[PDB]
Symmetry: D2
Subunit: 335 residues, 4 copies
Amino acid sequence: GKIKIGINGFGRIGRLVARVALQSEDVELVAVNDPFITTDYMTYMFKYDTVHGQWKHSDIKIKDSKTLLLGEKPVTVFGIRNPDEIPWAEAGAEYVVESTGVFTDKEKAAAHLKGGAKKVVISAPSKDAPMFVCGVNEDKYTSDIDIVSNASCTTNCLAPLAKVIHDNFGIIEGLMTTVHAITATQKTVDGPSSKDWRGGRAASFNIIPSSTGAAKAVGKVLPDLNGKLTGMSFRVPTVDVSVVDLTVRIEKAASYDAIKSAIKSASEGKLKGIIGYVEEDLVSTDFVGDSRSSIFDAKAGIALNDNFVKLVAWYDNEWGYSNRVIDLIRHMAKT
Amino acid sequence: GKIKIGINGFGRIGRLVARVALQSEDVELVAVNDPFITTDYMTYMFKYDTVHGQWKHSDIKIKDSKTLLLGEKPVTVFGIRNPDEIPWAEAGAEYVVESTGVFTDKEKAAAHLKGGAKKVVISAPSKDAPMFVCGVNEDKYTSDIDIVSNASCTTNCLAPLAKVIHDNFGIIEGLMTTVHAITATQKTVDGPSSKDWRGGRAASFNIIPSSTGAAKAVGKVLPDLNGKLTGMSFRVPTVDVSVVDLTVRIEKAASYDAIKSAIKSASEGKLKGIIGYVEEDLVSTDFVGDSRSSIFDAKAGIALNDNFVKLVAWYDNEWGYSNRVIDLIRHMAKT
Amino acid sequence: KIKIGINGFGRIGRLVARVALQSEDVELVAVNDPFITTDYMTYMFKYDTVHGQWKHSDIKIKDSKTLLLGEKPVTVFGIRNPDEIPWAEAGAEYVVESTGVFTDKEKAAAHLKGGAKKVVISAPSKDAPMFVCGVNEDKYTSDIDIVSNASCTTNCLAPLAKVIHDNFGIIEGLMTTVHAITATQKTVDGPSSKDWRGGRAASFNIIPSSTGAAKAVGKVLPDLNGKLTGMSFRVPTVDVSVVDLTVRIEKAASYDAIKSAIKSASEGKLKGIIGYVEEDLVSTDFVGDSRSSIFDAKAGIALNDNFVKLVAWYDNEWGYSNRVIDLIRHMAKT
Amino acid sequence: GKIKIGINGFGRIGRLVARVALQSEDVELVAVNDPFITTDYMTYMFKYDTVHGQWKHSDIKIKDSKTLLLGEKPVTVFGIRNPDEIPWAEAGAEYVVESTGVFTDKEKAAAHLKGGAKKVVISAPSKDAPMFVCGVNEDKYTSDIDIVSNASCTTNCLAPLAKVIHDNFGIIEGLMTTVHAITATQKTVDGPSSKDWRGGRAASFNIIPSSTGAAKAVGKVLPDLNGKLTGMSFRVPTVDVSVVDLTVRIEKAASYDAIKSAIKSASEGKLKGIIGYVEEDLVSTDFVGDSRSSIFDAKAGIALNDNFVKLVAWYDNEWGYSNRVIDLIRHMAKT
């Protein structure tokens, strides 16, 4: 039957979520709206990518410069700025992915109902919107909900990881630090930035300590962990891929070889597909294209003892998250 | 006596230009304006840099929410967006440096004048302003022209070179190409670029080529070389510095040495400090912080015959160019 | 049906391997390399950075010097001196000298001792006969056992020029190649007794490097001799390079006239060698483009019907690693 | 009292200790010897430095072949591929800075004595030699110990830190996660690295998780903290300056304010020159050329609870360290 959704904002996640859509069985992209991208550009954008190569799984021919015959199936293209104006219904979009980045408030992201959107999943943290992390609290969802936050490229990594170690060894207190690549919010040269004074520096030639909320966020998905965790971040000159680094003082004495078998049996378990397991000398690039939320590098980690350890978990901020986007609509539609 | 000027736009060129003035003893920066860099976020800027080392020539402290105080010599800051609405006259801007990559049109830049600024010098080739290149036509200036443009990071490099070869050889044609560094005009990751598609791709991950009017933009500074030139560019992952690839064909059959001797004996006194000469297995970074408008790589360059050669000229697009501003303005005030 | 062997398992060496395994033309049987173990190989060949991970078909170790690329096994050597690799004892007829230390007709002929019929050097050779694909693979008889497939750059600039030359005739020109860093560039300001510049930071500078790929053109295309030559700039990128060829032609022709001349050339007689693309693409846009040259329509600029700048791309690694296999396909059909 | 030094590893770390010596009003560089780099080539690498700026202090000319001539003072050159025959004293050098990183074994670096060498500082941990981290345990050097090791770019950071913290609050335990800038031990493109597989991956375009006993090393200069520390590393794409993401668990419940004032107070005290204290919104590069062994980033760190905090202190590996090297000599002699 396929869940008809509307991608609003054609950014990175914005089309990666697209790319992951037009290549499925249970979902179908029928319209995208980003006023800053003409259709004649919207194709080119979608077609070519520095990180995920050339499309070619359907052909791309513009039908009537406002459509976009995405090889057989059609996909309406809009340039409506205000979310209350975009006419989703008329085109046909039950669910609307929120990949524009400037409407995280449950309201500014709710303006999508008007147009006609039935359900709208905010593809970014939310100051007041139900945060659902696949494999952790996406279970705790109810129909009546119409506005959900799919957490952050990170969180979907830290949470599954935390739910693993915790359900097994209970996290006492723990600091996390993630070596993130650079996104569309960093300059290329020291420029102006009223929010992240530091992030307003050349992103390709420095290390920048951009603060996070991901862990203070895990307090949402996992309640018990609320307060036990926090952390930060380090932006770096890498294009894609990123990596968590949770250091926790578990409350159930166990060795590293035991915590590793844990994630593993958890990666082959219910969490199979969300949290991955890997025991091989790898490097950022080798995860470019990983459809998993969190990858566990059992060799990168280190343990000082059975009560204090440091765990490293890889994760494609772009690809993995973009899968977490559709995968949720897949859940919000089976409910 | 000590020309007082102000910069509109504290971008890379702003702070950098200031660094040339607040350093210089024949010019005195008096007022600045960047509607995006509130005073606070200004000190942290003007001081710490990622390409030209930290600032250590005069203490940087804020006297109040409306006036900095570099090296115990106050300077003012406005949060004004619209040019004209900036009280340039109040500080004492006998001159104003328009560096925002936007307001680069006679009328646009002509705004300032309203606030007071007796003169405005655009820092980017203008459509209706008379561009000049210190070391070529900076005499075609007159005290009757208020708005003027100061060539571009490149024009200031090709100009003086094509100058010395036309002044000593005979330019029939000759194409250019520039392996030019990034800029705050490009995106970090594949991003929408309204007018410059190629430019909307990952900055420090691609060999993004692009056109450069500077080519036959030098057909204005040196009216003699009309059409006799033209070229393009290649933006490569480099924070600063850039090089010129001039494949010129000449008439007066000359040997690569009869050139070096010229380009040197032309840097030894005619365009000394406005053009340099080096014969060393150098690289881009070696040129960081070079006030010369255009360095010549007496080695990297090649010759097919005494009539068809390739010449290479290194330049710190950022730093160097700047000194052309506070030299042009310096000169501009003498006439 | 054509068995081969590679000495030195570098990028080209591995990618030239990735070809023979996914091809139905050539088959990989030998792999000599003293600096990497059988156990280490099954990792330097698997997960890659520029060309991604190799999931195409399962890999597995059998028992040292033995390796399973799916179900087809490959002998793995560690001998250091070429003349001591028993190629003949594994089945490798053609020994691909993709190591970059043996480029002398004499030196790389050490395989010929190991019982290998012919050796294909994967780079310029001061004396061994050079043949660039699409240019003059015809100038090769079944009697030369020490050949060369020119360079990552010459395999690109070669066609592009010939195509222009045949149609509009070349009088004199020059070239530049904003090329990507390679195995012979230090990670940080280090030594290099031959290329000082080439020593400094690899991805933090723009290293100007000597290059006679244009000078080499002269050898694979007689009438173009002495009328070419250029330089190169080693900028901060992992792969793909570009050819900046500013040149004069005898038959004054509009830029479009070249475009179609070019475009029509890359549509029949040279299809799979040269390419023609008219879109705003970049470096990463060409990772894996098995072509030798790839003209960029909207890229180069013309100064008039008698002095234009033709620019073309070419994945130094893949485009080349592919042409090596293509020059073994030719020698295999003479 | 001029301490005559001798270098045996002219590399990123070798040239620097030379620069530091030529400016050290009390040290004397009299012999360099990285066999591969010659008297001609040597000048180049010493003069130009892609990172730490071009050398402008001295003048440096070449008096004959076998010897340089840095500003009036001659320095005997060496191209001896083996330590058992480098005539250190024959040229005059009580101390021999071992900067090859291929002779870290006491007996392997003792091949210097057999040439007329007295003390020999190995700028790299030794499996057997003694470790000293200036500001920490430089107390335990005894006139007799001829061969000594100088911790590491990394340890020479985590020690000043872990100390100023343990002294003031006592570390219960803790993990370190450093982000180092690629070095010569890497390859530019996926190449062989049999002793560190990951390492040989594209150094300029990846996130390679390395290992470093730097944290387990402090248990050698800090006897108490033995087995209380540990940690691995991440080599993101940069050139210089790094960070110590230290996660600890302190004894005396002390608020973050206090941990800042603890580092600071002692940063100006008995550790002046070793620890630093930045309370600004800085980034990577700003730390370039900072001789401190470990600058504390007051604003980067974050605390979960008054016992489990995360302190972050930057250190310019290459340069910062280099000094400590000399410093140990200024100390190894004065006793």
